[PDB]
Design a protein around this ligand. Structure first.
Ligand SMILES: [Zn+2]
Ligand SMILES: [Zn+2]
Lengths: 146, 272, 279, 275
RNA sequence: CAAACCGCCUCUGCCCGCG
RNA sequence: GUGGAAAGGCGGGCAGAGGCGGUUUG
């Protein structure tokens, strides 16, 4: 559906957008094609709104640090998982604007996939959020937003 | 014809990124430790590229000291697309022009090619220096382990001259002051001319120390400094007995223009 | 048919799956270096009077392959598909369970995987002054992870215990043929027992290169020579394995070759019973 | 004759990236798994080249220890295109010139061909080392099964000296820090030659510490590093009876320079008492 | 208690030599 | 009494040239 993201796709791709998202209130929801299948529809109706794109890469660098700590970097891979929660809303706690409604389709999917990691595996239980974190960015570039 | 071997002068030390240091790939990083590094390709090809133009300027003033510089005359071979003619920059790589002598007996007397080596058809001269990859020092492994930033993301812009419309981009560069540990091995294949090769390598090091290394450079992204540790000699009998029979030059607090010379290398002269 | 099975767990790539002619030569060169001259002749006498070894065949993780008898080609239609009949005739090595099937002229299955690969690596020769190169290519047998090669031994046990078992510990650190200074023919040796269920008939497939003393029934011809202390051996017509003789004991042949010692070429048979069709 | 086989084991550490190639330039890899490896020929011939150059420097100073280096003048036979005219690198294989001796009894006294092997005509002195093929240490197969990259892809460029035009190519290099596991099996054929052969082999290894191993070495692709585990003597009686008679020297934390002098008077005192 | 934008483009991306 | 013996896929090649974090707000 390359022609979807039409102008009413915000009023079309929010049929069940947050229900199954809140049903994925842990990280390891479903290893299958449901990850990519959810990750397309998440970015499918962000694109009709603004979604200022390049305010994400601090989480990318932080996941790189935690991934170096997967590669025998540090034994404590707990503090950087909490530092994302320290920076979870500071962005919408800094300045607002036109693309805030897409942030309404971004903040509701944070705490389902962010309150999990206190008693989690540090190396494991992490790759599926790590895949949803990139497939949304990827298909959002592919629909034409960046 | 006649490759010999007397020993191997080893140059060790540190490379000080006095300003930021860009070598693109995002700066390169080795896949295992994850830290950035300097390759030896990026460094040999920048000592060479400077000593090239140094020879090209003095191309007529040396041809009684270095023969087979008589067979060149300055410039590129781009305004007449031939391989080997009277011009100095006589090899096409892909679409660009670079001086490599085409034979063994021609390149044995080239000052560039007896030190950085050459190639060719039906003859080949191989190098005398080995320029190894330069990883971060012992201090900066741990400054990385203590949580510091080893790289930065710098943001630049491009301004329209008429309306001041500006257009940003992001570079990613090693932070200033970062220090990499290098090694350069000159393989003493002739005891007649090792002074000239060590002195030409120091000329290339000095010209690199006034220019940049990688990256934009004309905008500040270079500025490498060479902090010397040890010239060593490792003669032909170090490798057989194993005993510490190698001559060391004491230069732990000197400049690349301060080595360049008779006072330092006197025992290497006497050891021949 | 209870045979000792010698397994050659490879440490590198072989040059070729060793024939019986280059297993026996390797054993003789081992015995002449750990025992002496006068104990190679007792080895040869033990193989004249008694024992026999077979060729090497590939194994892959506790499945042992044996060559296909040629007894199944003339009556592969009476066993039985034209695709199956063609792939059932092309194939070279049958599994031990299938091989015991096909000795009795029963329907059998071919393995769907070969345990090695004939790969040719490019090498180079560099002169020492100019580093100026010259390629040639080199073929070798590169094995999988659990796969390797093995051969079988019949005969008494003092010959195995005094000659072949020391010869296999010697040849593990100097290989079976090929560029063995590149670490090619090397292996770790370990011995088991194999039992083969075989019909007691007049006809026998040979599991080693035959070099017969009379014409066999169905055969697959194989010229090969060798190299014995630098001297070229003349090309000899062995029969390849899996071929049907009747009551043909084979025969070793002594060569001349201009050496301090005679050079035997192992031309003995390794009989297993087989059931033929009417021709 | 034969008196046993000395087995040298240990590890190689690719301190910088290791590149060999498989004819946008791949490295050579095992056709079944897909992991890289260091060939035995690529290691052996690099050792032989290094020791050839070392010997060619010393054709005047070893004429009394090793005879039949008196038959050679230091140089090469490329200009005067007659093989074994009298220079050292005397045999032409295809287009390059190697020192390979032409006979048995001249190569029993030449220290290169006594160890690495000669070919000749009607004669053929075979080698006396087996440089066994080198595969990744099981730690680095476990790192390969953790999804970690075992090779990289390094982009280099060539640049016009006047107009600074990029002309890029890529090479596939093994990740720096890798570990391979080597074995070198020396064949004790004559009990006089053994000290000098193992000293020459360790000299050839120690020239390789300061040289490189395959690929663009002067652009920083070698820096191999030998980390020994143990030697074994494996005597003649071991292959006869199969007990544990083999002397195991232990040098677990020693480099090839710490091994040539430190252990050769001391860690081989047990082997000279058995010859 | 920061309003608004711009958040990468332009060019090459394996060759000469052994069989 | 080994289709063997001997043989470094390697020499040379800068991820580089160009580009104000900037325009308006007492
Ligand atoms: Zn030149
Ligand atoms: Zn020799």
């Amino acid at each position: 559906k390359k022609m979807l993201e039409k102008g009413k796709q915000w009023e079309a791709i929010q049929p069940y957008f947050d229900n199954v998202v809140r049903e994925a209130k842990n990280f390891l929801e479903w290893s299958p094609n449901k990850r990519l299948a959810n990750a397309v529809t998440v970015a499918a109706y962000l694109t009709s709104q603004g979604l200022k794109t390049n305010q994400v890469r601090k989480i990318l660098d932080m996941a790189r640090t935690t991934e170096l700590k997967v590669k025998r970097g540090e034994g404590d891979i707990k503090d950087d998982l909490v530092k994302m929660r320290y920076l979870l809303a500071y962005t919408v706690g800094k300045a607002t604007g036109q693309s805030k409604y897409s942030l309404d389709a971004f903040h509701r999917i944070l705490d389902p996939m962010l309150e999990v990691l206190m008693g989690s595996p540090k190396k494991e239980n992490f790759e599926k959020f790590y895949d949803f974190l990139q497939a949304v960015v990827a298909y959002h570039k592919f629909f034409g937003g960046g | 014809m006649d490759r010999r071997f007397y020993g191997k002068i080893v140059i060790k030390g540190k490379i000080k990124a006095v300003t930021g240091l860009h070598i693109g790939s995002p700066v390169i990083k080795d896949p295992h430790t994850g830290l950035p590094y300097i390759p030896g390709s990026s460094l040999k090809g920048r000592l060479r590229s400077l000593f090239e133009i140094l020879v090209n300027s003095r191309l007529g003033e040396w041809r009684e000291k270095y023969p087979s510089l008589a067979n060149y005359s300055p410039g590129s071979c781009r305004p007449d697309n031939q391989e080997n003619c009277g011009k100095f920059f006589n090899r096409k790589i892909n679409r660009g022009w670079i001086h490599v002598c085409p034979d063994y007996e021609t390149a044995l007397a080239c000052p560039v090619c007896r030190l950085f080596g050459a190639s060719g058809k039906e003859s080949n001269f191989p190098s005398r220096i080995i320029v190894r990859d330069a990883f971060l020092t012992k201090e900066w492994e741990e400054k990385w382990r203590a949580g510091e930033a080893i790289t930065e993301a710098k943001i630049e812009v491009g301004i329209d001259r008429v309306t001041s419309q500006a257009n940003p981009r992001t570079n990613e560069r090693v932070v200033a002051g970062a220090e990499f540990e290098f090694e350069i091995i000159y393989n003493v294949e002739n005891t007649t001319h090792w002074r000239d090769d060590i002195k030409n390598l120091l000329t290339a090091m000095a010209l690199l120390e006034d220019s940049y290394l990688g990256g934009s450079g004309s905008r500040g992204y270079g500025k490498v400094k060479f902090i010397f540790d040890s010239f060593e000699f490792r003669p032909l009998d170090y490798y057989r007995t194993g005993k510490d029979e190698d001559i060391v030059s004491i230069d732990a607090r000197e400049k690349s223009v301060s080595d360049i010379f008779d006072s330092l290398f006197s025992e290497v002269e006497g050891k021949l | 048919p209870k045979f000792i099975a010698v397994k050659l767990i490879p440490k590198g790539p072989f040059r070729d799956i060793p024939r019986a002619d280059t297993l026996f030569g390797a054993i003789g060169n081992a015995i002449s270096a750990i025992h002496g001259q006068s104990a190679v002749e007792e080895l040869v006498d033990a193989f004249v009077g008694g024992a026999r070894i077979s060729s090497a065949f590939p194994y892959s993780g506790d499945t042992y392959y044996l060559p296909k008898p040629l007894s199944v080609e003339p009556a592969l239609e009476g066993i039985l598909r034209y695709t199956t009949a063609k792939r059932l005739r092309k194939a070279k090595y049958l599994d031990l369970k299938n091989f015991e099937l096909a000795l009795r002229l029963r329907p059998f299955t071919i393995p769907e995987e070969i345990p090695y690969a004939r790969v040719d690596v490019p090498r180079v020769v560099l002169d020492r002054v100019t580093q100026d190169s010259s390629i040639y290519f080199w073929e070798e047998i590169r094995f999988r992870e659990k796969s390797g090669v093995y051969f079988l031994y019949s005969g008494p046990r003092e010959v195995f215990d005094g000659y072949i078992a020391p010869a296999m510990r010697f040849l593990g650190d100097t290989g079976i043929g090929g560029k063995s200074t590149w670490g090619a023919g090397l292996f770790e040796v370990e011995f088991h027992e194999m039992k083969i269920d075989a019909p007691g008939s007049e006809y026998s497939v040979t599991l080693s290169n035959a070099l017969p003393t009379k014409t066999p029934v169905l055969w697959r011809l194989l010229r090969k020579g060798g190299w014995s202390f630098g001297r070229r051996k003349p090309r000899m017509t062995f029969i390849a394995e899996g071929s049907i003789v009747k009551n043909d004991p084979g025969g070793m042949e002594r060569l001349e070759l201009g050496l301090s010692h005679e050079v035997y070429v192992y031309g003995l048979t390794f009989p297993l019973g087989v059931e033929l069709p009417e021709g």
